[PDB]
Design a protein around this ligand. Structure first.
Ligand code: HEM
Ligand code: HEM
Ligand code: HEM
Ligand code: HEM
Lengths: 141, 146, 141, 146
């Protein structure tokens, strides 16, 4: 469960991301495909090279979805509804993969926010990213 | 994998009793019903709408016997799993795009099927032996991923 | 989330367990300790030899708690309340281990309920142990 | 672990800039804050009640230092992680009762701290190399469990 101190930490950190959200989104993905080669099996149609526009474009979608998640932190299941139907009925990405993106997202944040990536903010972001993951896979079965 | 002499004997003695086709179809079938996301690869198989649909799907049954056949032949090479599955590992990665996580799921489903089929003869130490075998195979099948 | 069909499926299978729940709980644990040896790190203070009183007792404790969860399936959080706190503040078992016990409880059940362990009941059982595990872990952080 | 010439040089060059004293105290402090259940192994350290408490705790600091220093010796023997950590492996299992899963969590927190400390110097390809290192270190530590 996300506490009020959690919700504050997240809003504050995601506030700094700002207009770089799209850019952080893409680096996180790149971090994922390089560190966890198995995740690439879901993008056989993309050019996965560094500087890829396809990666860039998807990085932007992801990041915007989370900006959406942050805006609706107390009503996440409704905000992410269409996204949770999509991955459960069409994409069908194995649940283990949400942990791998979540960690790459975290490392991307750490590398860009030297002053804001406190031990406590680190803990609320990891909690927040597990709740997004839980919502997105809630309809798998 | 590292199995003692006694672990291999257990494994081979039980397997001797297996109807491959029969268990092949059942394990693949259960995977598709228990972990529906695994259905992504099987769109050309046809009707997968209900548990009965899946379990009665000839496409599923035939996939299941080909799958478990390959497993079955790997049991003869417990000392060299990687060597035996290296080509299959490459196919899975480069052409079929299968997340290795699927391999861990079938392994578990497989162990549930032997338990269902063997009742009390599937003892705790026989499970254990089989748990290594399954982990072994999944690791071997994921080793050429890149 | 558990559908209505799921709840019917779980209540039916657990019915058959009936009186053996306690012995089933012991066998599942012994299967866990043997297939997954790292789970033994949480029972250094137990005599883990086959048939030990400590295992059989614990086995009975675990089954009672499942039965309770089966009886109050429309309100698990509230029913397992005391159990979440204990595991969250005291025991502090890493969440990965709940998956391995869940698996060995499923193997136990397959082995003892030939007639009832259909494909559809297996799925409901697996979703059911995943919810129990989620409940038991919900107060960790 | 298998590392390309580029990966070995990546790992090695960054490690050279690290002060084990402080990266260690940080990684451990963060493990205890982000995954509070790991605090079960450190009841004797005292007050781990608030993020500020854990971080300023001197026992956490000394310990983190001890851990990372051992970690450092492994970089030097990246070719035989198993043989290098065998003693500590037995210790963590037999005497300490540490679920090996904890090794994985620590590995992940350490990557986070490297990113945070170094920023844009810690690029994707550098990350990936360091992901291989930590995973191999974790497997090396869990090796003698039984
Ligand atoms: C925080 C976690 C995640 C979020 C917020 C997220 C969100 C999204 C969004 C917003 C879309 C585009 C939907 C549309 O507008 O058409 C999408 C598509 C997609 N997602 Fe997810 N996703 C997440 C995790 C993942 C992971 C871990 C994987 C695989 C490893 C994955 C695989 C994909 C794929 C393959 C597509 C479709 C790509 C295409 O064909 O363009 N997602 N995701
Ligand atoms: C013990 C584990 C497995 C083994 C030994 C195995 C083995 C095989 C073999 C022998 C084939 C045919 C290869 C050839 O064309 O020469 C194959 C193809 C295939 N496998 Fe796997 N497999 C395993 C697990 C899985 C899993 C879990 C999935 C997906 C959920 C999967 C999906 C596929 C598909 C989609 C094909 C292609 C079928 C076709 O083109 O009709 N496999 N597998
Ligand atoms: C299906 C999930 C689980 C259930 C229903 C469950 C239930 C229980 C119950 C009823 C007790 C005893 C409570 C009491 O005496 O007040 C207990 C204690 C305990 N559980 Fe859990 N548990 C589960 C999962 C786990 C797992 C996965 C582990 C470790 C791998 C674990 C480790 C323990 C430990 C160490 C104790 C205390 C043992 C003792 O000193 O008696 N539990 N659990
Ligand atoms: C993955 C890297 C790790 C390495 C290289 C490492 C190494 C060490 C070393 C060198 C010692 C000191 C033994 C001595 O000074 O005699 C030690 C002790 C210890 N380690 Fe680990 N460790 C690691 C991770 C962990 C983790 C993740 C945990 C638990 C969360 C842990 C729990 C302990 C405990 C409880 C002690 C004993 C401290 C005391 O006496 O109070 N270690 N470890």
């Amino acid at each position: 469960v996300l506490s009020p101190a959690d919700k504050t930490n997240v809003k504050a950190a995601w506030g700094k991301v700002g207009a770089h959200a799209g850019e952080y989104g893409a680096e996180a993905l790149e971090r994922m495909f390089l560190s966890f080669p198995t995740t690439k099996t879901y993008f056989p149609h993309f050019d996965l090279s560094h500087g890829s526009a396809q990666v860039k474009g998807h990085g932007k979608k992801v990041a915007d979805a989370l900006t959406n998640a942050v805006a609706h932190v107390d009503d996440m299941p409704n905000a992410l509804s269409a996204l949770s139907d999509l991955h459960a009925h069409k994409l069908r990405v194995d649940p283990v993969n949400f942990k791998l993106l979540s960690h790459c997202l975290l490392v991307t944040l750490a590398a860009h926010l030297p002053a804001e990536f406190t031990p406590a903010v680190h803990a609320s972001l990891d909690k927040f990213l597990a709740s997004v993951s839980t919502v997105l896979t809630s309809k798998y079965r | 994998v590292h199995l003692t002499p006694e672990e291999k004997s257990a494994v081979t003695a039980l397997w001797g009793k297996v109807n491959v086709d029969e268990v092949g179809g059942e394990a693949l079938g259960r995977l598709l019903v228990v972990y529906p996301w695994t259905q992504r690869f099987f769109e050309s198989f046809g009707d997968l709408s209900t548990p009965d649909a899946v379990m009665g799907n000839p496409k599923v049954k035939a996939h299941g016997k080909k799958t478990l056949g390959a497993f079955s032949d790997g049991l003869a090479h417990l000392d060299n799993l990687k060597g035996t599955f290296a080509t299959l590992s490459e196919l899975h990665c480069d052409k079929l795009h299968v997340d290795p996580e699927n391999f861990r799921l079938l392994g578990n489903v497989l162990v549930c099927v032997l338990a269902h089929h063997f009742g009390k003869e599937f003892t705790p130490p026989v499970q254990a032996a089989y748990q290594k075998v399954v982990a072994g195979v999944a690791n071997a099948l994921a080793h050429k991923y890149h």
